[PDB]
Structure 1
Amino acid sequence: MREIVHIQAGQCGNQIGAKFWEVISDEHGIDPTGSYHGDSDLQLERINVYYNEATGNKYVPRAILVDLEPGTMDSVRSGPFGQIFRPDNFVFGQGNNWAKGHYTEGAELVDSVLDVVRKESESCDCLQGFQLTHSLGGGTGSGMGTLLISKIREEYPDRIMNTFSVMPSPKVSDTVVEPYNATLSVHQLVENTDETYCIDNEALYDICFRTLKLTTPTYGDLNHLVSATMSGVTTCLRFPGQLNADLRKLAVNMVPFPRLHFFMPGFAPLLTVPELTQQMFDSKNMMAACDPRHGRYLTVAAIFRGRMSMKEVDEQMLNVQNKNSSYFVEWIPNNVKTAVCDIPPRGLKMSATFIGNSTAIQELFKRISEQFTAMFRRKAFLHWYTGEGMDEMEFTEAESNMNDLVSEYQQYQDATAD
């Protein structure tokens, strides 16, 4: 067993966390009580990656729930599958300010969360590491989530830290301090995670509005996309296949330089094998509001789920690379790897999930950089933060580090083999 410990934090973190556990429990045949009423056993062969086994054949997600507000905890327990989680793994406090989540309010509660992390970790035969779901635009998931990463990283410096980070969009939330909170979190993520899935609320909205034609898409509409993606990118962690994937092998093969670890996920359909491939590389199927043809792919992981000719998948993946060869860096040979799993996600006979490390991700960070400096060069709203003891230099530094990430992404987009 190679256990992952899952952590969800803040408003957004706990919502997408529950849906992920709903979707993969359904795919592995676990009901809200934790019992296995499953058809195939491929579901149980690697089930220990994400589930603790309990007496009476109960499966408890290795999941820890955290928030500085007690409300969203209650909805989780009331929500579908709320009884499957272990009740001790709920940690709750009693405000959309990163500083409060990271330095003052969140610090007050972080020691209590680590106690729960330790308990689940000490029962592990061989811990892979952690995956954190959170938004970067609020206060708890953003500020306290990144504090938790630092504290966990200090205690498990040889484990992999992976996050699913939800980037803010004005198209979804009007809270003005989102660009500050996002920039401060990114500053933490660049230094202290090994892999981050950029789950962009702008792209999720744009998919719902344009592709899915929803005039006013809800957080429920957005998260349906998120659950499909999270199911896809975890496929090779959860099922037996030609590759024994784990979080470390994902990092090693996707991250050519430590800081360039922010992935564009893609999903299709939002079909024929050529079409799945064609759509999956399409900008309209990306969960990060970036156009890949505005950059170059350092590495790509592709997962095909369902029943299909793997010969045809092989040819189509070779085909898309040959026809789009300019958008894959030539100094990393064979930088696209494909995996195939027989079980499709719920409701689909065939799906394709895409994980790209693309220099076009700089567009996402550029967008946040604009909203950030629009306020900071006015020194606007700093008092919410300097009032907590923060220094102007800290905002300049977090801004400067995220500026550096875009330059570095631009540096390797322009590099050539000869």
Structure 2
Amino acid sequence: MREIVHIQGGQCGNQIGAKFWEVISDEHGIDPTGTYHNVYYNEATGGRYVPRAILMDLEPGTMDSVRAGPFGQLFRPDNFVFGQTGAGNNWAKGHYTEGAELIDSVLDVVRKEAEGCDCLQGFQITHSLGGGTGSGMGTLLISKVREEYPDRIMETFSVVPSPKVSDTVVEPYNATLSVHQLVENADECMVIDNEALYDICFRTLKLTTPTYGDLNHLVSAAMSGVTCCLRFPGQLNSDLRKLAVNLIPFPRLHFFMIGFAPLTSRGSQQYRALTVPELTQQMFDAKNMMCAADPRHGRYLTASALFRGRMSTKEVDEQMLNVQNKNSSYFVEWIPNNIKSSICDIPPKGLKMAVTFVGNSTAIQEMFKRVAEQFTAMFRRKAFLHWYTGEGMDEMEFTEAESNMNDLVSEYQQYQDATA
């Protein structure tokens, strides 16, 4: 009955997964032992609950990571598959030689869990696109599972590489090789990049020392709010498929943007009473999204907004109408009423209102444009190319991947410029 498996991958994917599971346990009132105080969790002996997630990585460090953090005992060792080497920023080490001998086993633990459900609404993945482990393994796994269950949808909660504040020197190769395959067998590539997360956590909460825990917690909140309207009843209910239908007009313009609301700090908290138009103004601000792409620099093909709490639906729909009608330039003409709404009935822990905004918008082709820029700048010199040539990989796959990337960005551009 509309269940969801939660596959992870790579160190960042594993961190985000642990954070998401503890946040969901907080919302659903579970404690770090798995006792109350079917869509996500599974029942187990003694009234215990275990998350329906699998955890894969080539290095065993993340094992001790997810064991060390709170709510680490919710999981089950049958879903702790782990290699030994660790890709170490070698995408091929996660897709052809080393990752393969793991993914096979992972398939089992997927089908050891998929058939456990009865009406599987679809999967969801949490990983990075720069790290060899996450990117490569998750890409091969997407391939396998989309070959297996083509009927269900496969969300990919991916964190694209930090465009300007790079932490590794091999980001472009892995990002391009991953996107080339993700654009085919995925349905929801909601991109996140740490540039936007630091921007938000600095200039919207005045925080002191933002560690990765806080970014993971923020992405966790957004992840939850995305499907909470299905987890709970509502005056106007949605799901993981209504979103897909109302968000993509063509089989490959499915790359989204994510936004959360509300977010303020203590000083700004004591003011600014909570009311739906204020939430709208905070949600449609440019810098208030998880993507380092000023959305004004593009148009919104379409955008859905899921509210959580008790409100007045007329106010919701009228705010949506006003905001799509006043700023008609930034929205696209050849499609009408291009905004979408939904409303749940249970907000988060002690938050009388909550907004989660997901937008398919052609303002995000710039991210791929600049990543491909870095790629082509690093490729015409064959720099750091032996590390990949050594693994049976050739040089044709790279130019094919870059040409597919450029075909995708050309699709975005071409069917942005169109009219009626």
Q: Shorter chain as normaliser: what TM range?
A: over 0.9
- CA contact 2:129–2:174 (8 Å) conserved in 1: yes
In terms of mean alpha carbon deviation, does 214-223 or 94-103 score higher?
Answer: 214-223
SS of the aligned residue for 2:383 comes to coil
Matched residue, 1:164: 157
**Counterparts of 1:214 and 1:34, CA distance in 2:** 32
**Counterparts of 1:89 and 1:135, CA distance in 2:** 20
Structure 1 letter corresponding to 2:198: Y
Structure 1 letter corresponding to 2:321: L
Structure 2 letter corresponding to 1:278: Q
1:341 aligns with 2:344: yes
Structure 2 letter corresponding to 1:202: E
**Counterparts of 2:36 and 2:162, CA distance in 1:** 39
Deviations 1:330-355 (A, max 9, x none): 33333211112233234533222110
Matched residue, 2:250: 257
1:241 aligns with 2:231: no
Matched residue, 1:149: 142
Matched residue, 1:378: 381
Matched residue, 1:101: 94
- CA contact 1:96–1:139 (8 Å) conserved in 2: yes
- CA contact 1:359–1:412 (8 Å) conserved in 2: no
Matched residue, 2:404: 401
1:301 aligns with 2:294: no
Structure 2 letter corresponding to 1:227: S
Matched residue, 1:20: 20
- CA contact 1:179–1:371 (8 Å) conserved in 2: yes
**Counterparts of 2:44 and 2:225, CA distance in 1:** 26
How far has the Cα of 1:90 moved from its partner?
Answer: 0.8
**Counterparts of 2:350 and 2:384, CA distance in 1:** 46
Matched residue, 1:40: none
How far has the Cα of 1:115 moved from its partner?
Answer: 0.5
Structure 2 letter corresponding to 1:64: I
In terms of mean alpha carbon deviation, does 205-214 or 100-109 score higher?
Answer: 205-214
Q: How does 1:358-377 map to 2 (within 5 A)?
A: 358-377=361-380
**Counterparts of 1:363 and 1:260, CA distance in 2:** 14
Task: Specify which of 215, 224, 230 is matched with residue 231 of structure 1.
Answer: 224
In terms of mean alpha carbon deviation, does 9-18 or 197-206 score higher?
Answer: 197-206
SS of the aligned residue for 2:96 comes to helix
**Counterparts of 1:60 and 1:377, CA distance in 2:** 49
Task: Tell me the TM-score normalised to structure 2 length.
Answer: 0.92
Deviations 1:168-191 (A, max 9, x none): 115554211011111111111101
- CA contact 1:8–1:66 (8 Å) conserved in 2: yes
Task: Specify which of 27, 33, 40 is matched with residue 50 of structure 1.
Answer: 40
- CA contact 1:209–1:216 (8 Å) conserved in 2: no
More helix by share: 1
- CA contact 1:302–1:352 (8 Å) conserved in 2: yes
Structure 2 letter corresponding to 1:71: G
SS of the aligned residue for 2:4 comes to strand
Give me the identity figure in percent.
Answer: 90
Deviations 1:262-303 (A, max 9, x none): 110011223332121012111111111112211111121101
**Counterparts of 2:279 and 2:294, CA distance in 1:** 18
Matched residue, 2:177: 184
How far has the Cα of 1:85 moved from its partner?
Answer: 1.1
SS of the aligned residue for 2:95 comes to helix
1:83 aligns with 2:73: yes
Q: 1:289 to 1:346 in 2, by over 3 A?
A: farther
Q: Which runs of 5+ in 1 are unaligned?
A: 38-47
Alignment size in residue pairs: 407
RMSD, aligned α-carbons: 1.7
Deviations 1:98-124 (A, max 9, x none): 100111111011011111000111111
Task: Tell me the TM-score normalised to structure 1 length.
Answer: 0.93
Task: Specify which of 110, 129, 135 is matched with residue 103 of structure 2.
Answer: 110
How far has the Cα of 1:77 moved from its partner?
Answer: 2.1
Task: Specify which of 167, 174, 199 is matched with residue 174 of structure 1.
Answer: 167
Matched residue, 1:285: 288
Structure 2 letter corresponding to 1:84: L
In terms of mean alpha carbon deviation, does 222-231 or 138-147 score higher?
Answer: 222-231
